[PDB]
Design a protein around this nucleic acid. Structure first.
Ligand SMILES: [Mg+2]
Ligand SMILES: [Mg+2]
Ligand SMILES: [Mg+2]
Ligand SMILES: [Mg+2]
Ligand SMILES: [Mg+2]
Ligand SMILES: [Mg+2]
Ligand SMILES: [Mg+2]
Ligand SMILES: [Mg+2]
Ligand SMILES: [Mg+2]
Ligand SMILES: [Mg+2]
Ligand SMILES: [Mg+2]
Ligand SMILES: [Mg+2]
Ligand SMILES: [Mg+2]
Ligand SMILES: [Mg+2]
Ligand SMILES: [Mg+2]
Ligand SMILES: [Mg+2]
Ligand SMILES: [Mg+2]
Ligand SMILES: [Mg+2]
Ligand SMILES: [Mg+2]
Ligand SMILES: [Mg+2]
Ligand SMILES: [Mg+2]
Ligand SMILES: [Mg+2]
Ligand SMILES: [Mg+2]
Ligand SMILES: [Mg+2]
Ligand SMILES: [Mg+2]
Ligand SMILES: [Mg+2]
Ligand SMILES: [Mg+2]
Ligand SMILES: [Mg+2]
Ligand SMILES: [Mg+2]
Ligand SMILES: [Mg+2]
Ligand SMILES: [Mg+2]
Ligand SMILES: [Mg+2]
Ligand SMILES: [Mg+2]
Ligand SMILES: [Mg+2]
Ligand SMILES: [Mg+2]
Ligand SMILES: [Mg+2]
Ligand SMILES: [Mg+2]
Ligand SMILES: [Mg+2]
Ligand SMILES: [Mg+2]
Ligand SMILES: [Mg+2]
Ligand SMILES: [Zn+2]
Lengths: 60, 31, 155, 207, 50
RNA sequence: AGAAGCACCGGCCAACUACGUGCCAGCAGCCGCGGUAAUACGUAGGGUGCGAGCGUUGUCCGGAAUUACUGGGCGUAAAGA
RNA sequence: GCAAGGCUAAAACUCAAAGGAAUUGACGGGGGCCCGCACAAGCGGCGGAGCAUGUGGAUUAAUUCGAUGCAACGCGAAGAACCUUACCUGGGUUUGACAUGCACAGGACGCGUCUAGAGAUAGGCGUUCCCUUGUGGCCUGUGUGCAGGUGGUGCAUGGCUGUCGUCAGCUCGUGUCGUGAGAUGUUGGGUUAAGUCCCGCAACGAGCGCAACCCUUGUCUCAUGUUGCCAGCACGUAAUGGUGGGGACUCGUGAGAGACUGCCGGGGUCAACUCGGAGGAAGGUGGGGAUGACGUCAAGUCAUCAUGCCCCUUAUGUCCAGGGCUUCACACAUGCUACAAUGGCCGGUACAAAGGGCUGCGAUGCCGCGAGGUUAAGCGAAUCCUUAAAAGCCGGUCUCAGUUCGGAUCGGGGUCUGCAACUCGACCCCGUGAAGUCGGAGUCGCUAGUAAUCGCAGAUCAGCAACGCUGCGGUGAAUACGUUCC
């Protein structure tokens, strides 16, 4: 998103309820996971690149 | 599309005949 | 569909009654997946019936179904500037299913408290020839007979 | 687009994950610095022509494998730049690092390098209609290439309207799972914007 | 969601398999504890001692 | 030592980049340009063609085998009463 | 010429065309063959009610921006009380929250306290380890190139995506025909779900496509035995494989086998293939998924990210407190609950699958009607928790009523999270008990373990408007003669 906002998210805000998570790679504020710390698009392309382990597609 | 060439002539002739029928009397018979 | 007819589904013999029409009528009655409920309803209808019939209940239900079986329906078609209907013969497997579907539909709106004895008196009055589906039989029949004149369009 | 990643497909069928480790609780903060190390090694090092980067991490000892076109620049005067990137990696990860810049055994059949070569030449502003053809000729001189498809999209020479055209030869079955197809995509930088260069290279069914 | 914006009805599925095995060696010997400790495990495999 | 200017630079047609303007100003023979990145408008630089000349107009011929004697055509293109 | 009008026959003006043949497509209320829940036959719905949500509109100080037939509208947004936030009011600030280049100067910083809505401003403590010995580390102060921008342009763009459409087509090289655009190959007879294949032919071949290789489910063999299993023994305390114990079985998960028109009967040039059978768990592709050819829509995204140009620098940058993105005479869109007896309620009683758990799962016991509260065992999990699944069966009551339906609505009282619950969270108890009695024109989904119906789980997430989205399983249907019509 904005650099001031990614800095704010990386910092330690007061009133810990205020703390949230952004993308680890682009700073997207939405659709970000916790086990991945990584948003949906920047998880999709990373996993397609196979640069994060244990991930593939599925079919059941 | 050679019929188009006939349609243009048809329309021109039709309008001329319509004008003559509008004036087959002293509208045009005097002149 | 396009590639011929689709295969039908077999229906196994009933345990209570060595007959298939009970197994198929209960499935018609079935709604939302209460096979148990519909089955106890059908069985309760026949077992309530035998007291007022004396005859075997499936024999009575066959007597009813022979009454309410269609023969010739009124299937629609539009040809020119006006649509109309075509009298067409009904094959027996369609006819019985249509008849007992009418039975279920008009037993869902008949005037008693609950559907067990609703269907019960439906079965007995259809075996005696007086019911709502019974009168539908000979009104659909006469509607189709009044359009026999269009039977010469059989697709 | 409408084409999925062949790497995404054949990941676990034909090709392998770039990073192999195990974690349950600290995977998130391994990924956090994995993205950082890829930024680091992709920033300021484009001259070496990176091909790919492997990461291994096992109980507080990490191994960063790097395959590039030229192992010459990164090593420098017998370790003037390799140790420099090692130190700027140490101050980043807080962890002793076995960095291993190996090689790419041939930097002309390996996609993710064909794309950068074409892109750098586009930045040099010579004809992409010679670029793609010479990529074809350079990619049909290896013993093992049964097909290559090159696709470049963009303004492509100052055109006001973009366009995306591709050349190909041999067979490149992107719908075949038993097909070893290696994919590369690089963003050529030029005076009028950015040009997408994507290359698929087919190297046989499987060995 | 596949698209960066506006398309709900197109998705992708990504999954994780973690495979578990046990061995349960029985016979304890003092000279093999060090042997168990000195094992070059592969990179993606993790080992616990109970 | 007293003595050079004119026209043009998208194709015909020989001769190109930048800045100012942004369907406006405007250019133009033709087909077209300019609606935010103009080799086509204004300016600058460069260049080309000329040069005491260079351009615009008008007139005529040519290209026009588009009045055909040289040297044309008429089933469907204009053209068999 | 009776007339109708015919014959002869201009110019002004205006345009850069008008035309003729042929090619490729597209289209036709043209023809033929065919396919698709396209129709048809059914099942259940929406449009009616209330509510949730998005959108148009409106209003406001702002109601951020994008998405606008299908293919925008439970969409971006897989979680707006703060934050997110891009919006507004105000309090500040302004080499900045953040990154690097150039000059002069030496602790940055951390605890705790005061005021202030907070941002921050101030007392004062702790204070430069490192030869700030010019050299090392960092930092502020003063600047100076900047940083920054969710500011514009998706009609300058890359990347990603939708859509026709998982429709079976799209093409290419050599050769040939034609002045040429182009054509043939790719047409013709069969066949297939398929440009799938056989026979002919100025065609000969190849590629992207279809198919298969991949995953999941459906059977069997070998090894395997813990946290999984209990057939023959022993123990069984409270009978909870609890224990010793065993590889029988399940199950777990590794390797495999099997399905390939493989075999027989009939038809067909003996072809492609086709109908029917034997064996087989599965038969002609076993089912489902992943898969989106060339391209189309100047389709969407400059707001994931990157980005060519344009734009601000005491402001569009930036920090903080509030309010707004949740408003409301209306309109549309997608859903949940209903309008009951195939049901309401009471009680008893069975049968799962898939997932989650250390910032945690909370077994038992006790308190409270309940949400919940407390002690605390065990469990990073085939161990323990989640967990009792719910619909289902049995018995009793209710008896067609705006009800022993419906559960919106309101008052009162609360729990939990979160500094904080009014704007604007969820859950619980009592009383109150609306609209709604099956919804017009019109319109939607669905062909089998499907519709329908019932719960369970997850992502996001402290909490959650979770009825949204993605998954798991219980019960479980009726119809499809067929292509006239849409
Ligand atoms: Mg395929
Ligand atoms: Mg010239
Ligand atoms: Mg300009
Ligand atoms: Mg000019
Ligand atoms: Mg002149
Ligand atoms: Mg002449
Ligand atoms: Mg002239
Ligand atoms: Mg001539
Ligand atoms: Mg002649
Ligand atoms: Mg003529
Ligand atoms: Mg004649
Ligand atoms: Mg003509
Ligand atoms: Mg023609
Ligand atoms: Mg034609
Ligand atoms: Mg047609
Ligand atoms: Mg279907
Ligand atoms: Mg229908
Ligand atoms: Mg409504
Ligand atoms: Mg909006
Ligand atoms: Mg939806
Ligand atoms: Mg807010
Ligand atoms: Mg576009
Ligand atoms: Mg020729
Ligand atoms: Mg063809
Ligand atoms: Mg052709
Ligand atoms: Mg083929
Ligand atoms: Mg557009
Ligand atoms: Mg738009
Ligand atoms: Mg911008
Ligand atoms: Mg604020
Ligand atoms: Mg909103
Ligand atoms: Mg009970
Ligand atoms: Mg109690
Ligand atoms: Mg009961
Ligand atoms: Mg109630
Ligand atoms: Mg009412
Ligand atoms: Mg009623
Ligand atoms: Mg949650
Ligand atoms: Mg949160
Ligand atoms: Mg289900
Ligand atoms: Zn991201």
């Amino acid at each position: 998103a904005k650099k001031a906002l990614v800095n704010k998210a990386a910092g330690k805000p007061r009133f810990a309820v205020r703390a949230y998570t952004r993308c680890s790679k682009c700073g997207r504020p939405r659709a970000v996971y916790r086990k991945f710390g990584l948003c949906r698009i920047c998880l999709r392309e990373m996993a397609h690149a196979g640069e994060l382990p244990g991930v593939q597609k599925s079919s059941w | 599309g050679s019929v188009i060439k006939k349609r243009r002539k048809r329309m021109s002739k039709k309008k001329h005949r319509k004008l003559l029928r509008r004036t087959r009397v002293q509208r045009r018979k005097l002149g | 569909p396009r590639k011929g007819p689709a295969p039908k589904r077999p229906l196994v013999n009933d345990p209570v009654y060595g007959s298939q029409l009970v197994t198929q009528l209960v499935n018609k009655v079935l709604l939302k997946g209460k096979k148990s409920l519909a089955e106890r309803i059908v069985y309760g209808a026949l077992e309530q019936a035998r007291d007022k019939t004396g005859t075997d209940p499936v024999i009575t239900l066959k007597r009813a179904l022979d009454n309410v079986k269609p023969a010739l329906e009124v299937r629609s078609r539009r040809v020119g500037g006006a649509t109309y209907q075509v009298p067409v013969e009904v094959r027996p497997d369609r006819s019985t299913t249509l008849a007992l579907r009418w039975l279920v539909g008009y037993s869902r709106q008949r005037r008693e408290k609950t559907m067990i004895e609703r269907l019960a008196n439906e079965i007995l009055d259809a075996s005696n020839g007086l019911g709502a589906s019974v009168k539908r039989r000979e009104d659909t029949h006469k509607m189709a007979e009044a359009n026999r004149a269009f039977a010469h369009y059989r697709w | 687009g409408q084409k999925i990643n062949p790497h995404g497909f054949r990941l676990g069928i034909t090709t392998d994950w770039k990073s192999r480790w195990y974690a349950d609780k600290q995977y998130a903060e391994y990924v956090k610095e994995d993205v950082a190390i890829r930024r680091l090694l992709s920033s300021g090092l484009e001259r070496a022509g990176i091909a790919d980067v492997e990461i291994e991490r096992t109980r507080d000892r990490v191994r960063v494998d790097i395959h590039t076109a030229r192992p010459g620049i990164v090593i420098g005067r017998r370790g003037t730049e390799a140790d420099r990137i090692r130190a700027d990696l140490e101050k980043l990860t807080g962890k002793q690092v076995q960095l291993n810049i190996l090689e790419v055994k041939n930097p002309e059949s390996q996609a993710q390098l064909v794309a950068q070569g074409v892109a750098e030449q586009l930045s040099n502003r010579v004809a992409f209609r010679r670029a793609m053809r010479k990529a074809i000729q350079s990619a049909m001189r290896q013993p093992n290439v049964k097909g290559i498809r090159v696709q470049c999209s963009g303004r492509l020479g100052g055109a006001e309207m973009s366009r995306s055209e591709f050349y190909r030869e041999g067979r490149v079955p992107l719908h075949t799972l038993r097909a070893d197809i290696d994919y590369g995509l690089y963003e050529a930088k030029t005076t009028f914007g950015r040009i997408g260069v994507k290359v698929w290279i087919y190297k046989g069914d499987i060995v | 969601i596949r698209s960066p914006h506006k398309y709900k009805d197109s998705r992708e599925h990504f999954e994780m398999r973690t495979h578990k095995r046990l061995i349960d060696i029985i016979d304890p010997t003092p000279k093999t504890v060090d042997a168990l400790m000195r094992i070059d495990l592969p990179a993606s495999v993790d080992v616990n001692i109970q």
